[PDB]
Symmetry: C5
Subunit: 209 residues, 5 copies
Amino acid sequence: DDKLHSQANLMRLKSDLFNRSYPGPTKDDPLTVTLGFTLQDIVKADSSTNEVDLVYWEQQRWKLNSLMWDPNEYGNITDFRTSAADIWTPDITAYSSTRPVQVLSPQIAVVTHDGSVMFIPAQRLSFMCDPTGVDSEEGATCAVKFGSWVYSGFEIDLKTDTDQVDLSSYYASSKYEILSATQTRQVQHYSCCPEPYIDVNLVVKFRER
Amino acid sequence: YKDDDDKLHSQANLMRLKSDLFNRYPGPTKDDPLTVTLGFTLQDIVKADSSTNEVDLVYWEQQRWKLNSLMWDPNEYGNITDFRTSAADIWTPDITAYSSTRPVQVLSPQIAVVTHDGSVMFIPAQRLSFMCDPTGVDSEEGATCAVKFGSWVYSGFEIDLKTDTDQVDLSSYYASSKYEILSATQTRQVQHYSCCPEPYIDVNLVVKFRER
Amino acid sequence: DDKLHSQANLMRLKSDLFNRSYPGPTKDDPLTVTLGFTLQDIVKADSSTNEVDLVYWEQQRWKLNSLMWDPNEYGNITDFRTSAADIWTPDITAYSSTRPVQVLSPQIAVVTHDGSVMFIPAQRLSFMCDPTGVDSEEGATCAVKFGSWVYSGFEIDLKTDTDQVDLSSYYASSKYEILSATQTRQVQHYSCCPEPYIDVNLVVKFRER
Amino acid sequence: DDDDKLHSQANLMRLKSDLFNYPGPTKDDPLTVTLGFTLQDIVKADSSTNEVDLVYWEQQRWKLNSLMWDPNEYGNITDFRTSAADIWTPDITAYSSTRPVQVLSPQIAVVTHDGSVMFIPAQRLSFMCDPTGVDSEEGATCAVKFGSWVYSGFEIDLKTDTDQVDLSSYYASSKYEILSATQTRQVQHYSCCPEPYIDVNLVVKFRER
Amino acid sequence: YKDDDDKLHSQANLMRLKSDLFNRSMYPGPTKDDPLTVTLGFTLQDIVKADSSTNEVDLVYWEQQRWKLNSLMWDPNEYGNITDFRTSAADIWTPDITAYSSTRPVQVLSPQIAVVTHDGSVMFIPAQRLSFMCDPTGVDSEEGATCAVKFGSWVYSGFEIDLKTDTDQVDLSSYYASSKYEILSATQTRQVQHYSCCPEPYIDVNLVVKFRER
Ligand SMILES: c1cncc([C@H]2[C@@H]3C[C@H]4C[C@@H](C3)CN2C4)c1
Ligand SMILES: c1cncc([C@H]2[C@@H]3C[C@H]4C[C@@H](C3)CN2C4)c1
């Protein structure tokens, strides 16, 4: 019965939240998405096509008024897990991939009572990269931008929580050593559009182990 | 609390607009034809395979069209001038590469932008393998290949294709590609086939390239 | 208002047809499918596995009473488009593929007021084929049967409009040239089932350009 | 005649409606599945990974009281086709595959008025096999077992019509020729559990052509 | 006709049971207030391929998962003496156990069907092919090569899902006898680790395999 009670409280929360009266962000109702990368592995560097294959965890975080609740009204529940399909998620995309991203983890988000969401898909990505110099001490340098496909900086702003990519889980016996890995918010002016555009630029310098 | 009420207000206006529009288009017909504007942004020639004569491209395919049924007065909807929506929520054109050798791979979210004048813009990123003899790519002259894009089931009487320019946009071409672009054009072609009285329209993407 | 009139006539037509009171063909209500192939490219011939990859257009046509209408009753509309997934379509299958067929085009059918349906997918198909001889003047010959996977000749019959496969859209700079290509109706019996099954046999003779 | 075609069509729709308005087999309600293979091709024998790739047709038959009807009550209809998704199908699985099976045919089944079902998916299968000896006169030998993943012999009894694999469609210009192919029902008894477990062992001996 | 009725009878009893369990008023997954223990057991069937150009190895294994829920208990006496049943894994909550270092999406080789027993226990055993991060250097020597991959919930911390094994010993009794690689050693071990994202501990089972060319 006690177990039944906490389960009903959570079901009540989710029912309350998911039947509320979210169309995504707008210039009137903008959103900030925080991005951070945890680089696991540079799997392959193909010098015949200039593609490199990375494996990483991409941490996304955003906050929505419509996902807030007072834990006191819901049995002291302070967070819950739910399918990422149950909620709005941002359309963060690599801007220079050469193959569809392959998702390596379940698509499940953690929602917290302050309305914040954490969603961390693991991905394998092939992106445009010239690995010349990777067989040298200086190594090779490559970069890929991540951002919304269709929202401007007026509707979705981005930030990182740190400039430094998390290398604490980088595979110690990878074919490639990381010499440095940074992630930087960029502000772009494009001649085509009045709106500012924002991306996060992931830059990795690496060489053969 | 006032700030919260204002967000809900804007959110409610957008949901009312979307609800109004998606409860009101069966695709183009001879009586009601549609002009679709195409433009390519070429990002990369990834691979040129001389053993199979396939060449792989990455590009952004901009598609634009305008429907009366998607029009609205911003004054009636909280001054909203446009919105983002799933491409599955609206009709989209069946523009197809005519000489692909693999199903095209989509690299971007399939989300379109709709503006109050009824115009839609949809720009999927794609990787395409298509029929191309790369002979000469290892030379100053380079190699030349072409692929036509057009509707699968609509003739020129139902969908007219336009380009805004004959010049492919190369301002985002990957600087360290294995292949450099000598030229890239996109040309509207009107075709008359012996099989059928109705005219056909395609856009011919012609790319000249060589090893960097 | 005129445009809305045109559009309303089209929706009325599809509504009327879609709500009729077609379960597929039966022995009492058999169907004839016209099948035609147009070859675009022999992409690859693998002599290590005896698999060859072909790109082609497969033209399928059939006619249903239930899809007929009088254009006078419907604003003179003579035809319309529908997703192939929204109507019954014949389960035409290559008998000797070695990988799932890959679809290179939209799956959209054209329905005409006389009740005829035209569906023309572009496909890439890997099938069983020994390319020995392809580097000689006489080339190599291969064949693949196409037919309904589950309907016998008593429910689905097949016909061609011509025995000669159209080569005029064949890729002029393919690694392989076509020496001949024919398509022929065949009737076959298998131990599993008492009824005959119909196929169209595609026979292609080809060699290195 | 248009009325007659609608008549037979209505009869079929009525039948299907009646039938499609079963929790799987149980110890109290057991089911026999008959299996037979038609081996079409050994496509590939990979001595670098000890994987061999087979293309075959897997015939499955079983019968359910819930699918029976009197043809006299339904316009003399004696069978019909229906999507395999519309009915229960057995979970027959290869026990040593190394890749997900690739489906090469439409998933459509044939139901007969006696309640029997015939379902014959064409598949490409990679499975565990050491092809050592394949380039010799004696050839190589490989084996793979098929059976239910989750049902015991008290729920699903497996049977074959014949211990001979059907070779009547084996690709005559395969890279590999068949020396013999058998499909043998095996019953195993285990000390752990009161119920017996059943499989069909597919054994193929083959060599380079 | 009596037998036909009896069959219908047992079928109705099973459908009644399933309808009753799947409409209970609903298991929302584990929480800090209602935590769950998941037992894992690995059966290694084959090392298919070792790729020294990319340091990726491909395994085939069966991943046995077991857990128990109150909401899935019934009295067999109330349901025709039914003591267990099979059901699609989509009909029930299942744990999001994930390899932490795969390099390609895991491929499932077996039907997604679970077995539920009257005491509320569940057994789900998917067969999988996995590519993961692994340096095969040494595989062609007597000492062979050693690699490891962690398995754990992707989104549930140790406060919601505890993972356990029953044994250190990876089951090798169905390992392919003519594999390109023979297994020198295989162990499965529970671990607790912290990550940058969160303050909570996450639990994994570490699968360690020593292998060499046969
Ligand atoms: C009946 C039901 N499903 C499939 C079939 C198959 C069988 C194998 C092959 C030939 C014939 C028999 C029709 N078709 C293709 C028949
Ligand atoms: C919380 C929410 N989403 C994802 C996670 C990830 C994080 C990376 C990795 C380890 C740990 C932390 C759990 N899991 C896999 C935690």
